Design an enzyme around this catalytic site. Sequence first.
Site, short mmCIF file in Angstrom:
data_model
loop_
_atom_site.label_atom_id
_atom_site.label_comp_id
_atom_site.label_asym_id
_atom_site.label_seq_id
_atom_site.Cartn_x
_atom_site.Cartn_y
_atom_site.Cartn_z
N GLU A 54 0.85 -1.41 -0.01
CA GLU A 54 0.33 -0.04 0.07
C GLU A 54 0.86 1.17 -0.11
O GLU A 54 2.00 1.72 0.56
CB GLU A 54 -0.90 -0.57 1.22
CG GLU A 54 -0.52 -0.27 2.71
CD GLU A 54 -1.39 0.42 3.67
OE1 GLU A 54 -2.25 -1.03 4.40
OE2 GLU A 54 -1.76 1.13 3.73
N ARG A 65 -2.70 11.90 6.61
CA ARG A 65 -2.87 10.44 5.34
C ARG A 65 -3.65 10.65 4.69
O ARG A 65 -4.09 9.87 3.66
CB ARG A 65 -1.93 9.60 5.51
CG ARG A 65 -0.33 9.96 5.82
CD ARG A 65 -0.17 8.48 6.46
NE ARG A 65 -0.35 7.20 4.90
CZ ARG A 65 -0.77 6.08 5.57
NH1 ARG A 65 -0.56 5.68 6.30
NH2 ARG A 65 -0.20 5.26 4.08
N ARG A 69 -5.34 5.90 -1.57
CA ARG A 69 -4.11 5.11 -1.49
C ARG A 69 -3.98 3.77 -2.82
O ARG A 69 -5.84 3.97 -3.14
CB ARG A 69 -4.34 3.35 -0.64
CG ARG A 69 -4.94 4.15 0.73
CD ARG A 69 -2.99 4.99 1.57
NE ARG A 69 -3.54 4.95 3.33
CZ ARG A 69 -3.91 6.79 3.12
NH1 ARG A 69 -4.33 7.21 2.27
NH2 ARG A 69 -3.97 6.10 4.38
N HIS A 85 -10.65 4.79 1.71
CA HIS A 85 -9.81 3.60 3.16
C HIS A 85 -9.89 2.33 3.13
O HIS A 85 -10.49 0.99 4.16
CB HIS A 85 -10.34 4.02 4.26
CG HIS A 85 -9.43 4.25 5.45
ND1 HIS A 85 -8.29 5.58 5.46
CD2 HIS A 85 -8.47 2.94 6.39
CE1 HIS A 85 -7.44 5.09 6.39
NE2 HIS A 85 -8.00 3.67 6.70
#
Length: 96
Positions: A54, A65, A69, A85
């Site tokens: 990731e 953050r 991703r 997420h």
Amino acid sequence: KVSGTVCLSALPPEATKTLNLIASKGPFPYSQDGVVFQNRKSVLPTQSYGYYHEYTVITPGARTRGTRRIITGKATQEDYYTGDHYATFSLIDQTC
């Protein structure tokens, strides 16, 4: 499961920046970048510890953050985007 294939050109500009950092093997902004993605919920096809990794896709301005991703797989051009997420994934198509 994979919600569908998505063109890289449709993703936030930061996803392109993350892919280029993955391509150059860094350097990465965060120590969670390039950690193994253990894929706990079986949202992606199951594989041995270390088939997935990731990376942060920066949310501009955020104090954290955030929730974006890219998870790499081992196959050529096997990369998935999530904006929520690790709840849902799209396979990234870097050719469009």
